[PDB]
Design a protein around this ligand. Structure first.
Ligand code: H0M
Length: 186
């Protein structure tokens, strides 16, 4: 099946806990996969304009590890719950992708999660201005604008709203699309 095939692909890129004990400032992100209308989508947040770090930018749910977290995957799930109301029973964490090094002292670990079909986002307005889906296949043929670094523009055909996706967020979206969608019969 589509979901079994995605999980099987994702598992081949799982690095697991290999890098998780290293003494960094630690953040986790959830790359949330949603199946709608026969296709896979990624769920993105738009950060509240109130936030000091990157107000109004598109990112994945996630945040800083805290002492309660049993592991890095727990960080991502805790933060996703706080930000968009995703409950742990509504997500299956399939794997841990390549961590992202930033600022010399920070390590961001991404987890891919399969999201339950009955989940409906409840944006927490103190943290999240908007939540939206992008079809995973979009990231294979994105609409690119050079700002000189590359920015994706995605227009939701439901309402005509355009979102800008860039940086680590855009890079991780492409990675997940390659992993899941490369080399498939039609
Ligand atoms: O803070 C995060 C996770 C993260 C961590 C490092 C980089 C990044 O782009 C994203 N995501 C968030 C925070 C508030 C509202 C929505 N989403």
């Amino acid at each position: 099946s589509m979901l079994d095939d995605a999980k099987a692909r994702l598992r081949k890129y799982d690095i697991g806990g290999k890098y998780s004990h290293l003494p960094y400032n630690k953040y986790s992100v959830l790359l949330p996969l949603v199946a709608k209308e026969g296709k896979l989508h990624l769920l993105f947040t738009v950060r509240s304009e109130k936030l000091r770090r990157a107000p109004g930018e598109v990112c994945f749910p996630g945040g800083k590890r805290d002492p309660t977290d049993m592991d890095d995957a727990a960080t991502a799930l805790r933060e996703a719950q706080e930000e968009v109301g995703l409950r742990p029973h509504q997500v299956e964490v399939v794997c841990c992708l390549v961590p992202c090094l930033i600022d010399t002292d920070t390590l961001i670990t991404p987890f891919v999660g399969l999201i339950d079909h009955n989940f409906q986002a409840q944006p927490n307005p103190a943290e999240v201005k908007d939540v939206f889906l992008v079809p995973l296949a979009y990231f294979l043929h994105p609409q690119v604008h050079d700002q000189i670094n590359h920015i994706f523009e995605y227009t939701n055909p439901e309402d005509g709203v355009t979102y800008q996706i860039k940086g680590m967020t855009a890079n991780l979206a492409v990675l997940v699309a390659f992993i899941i969608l490369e080399k498939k019969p039609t």
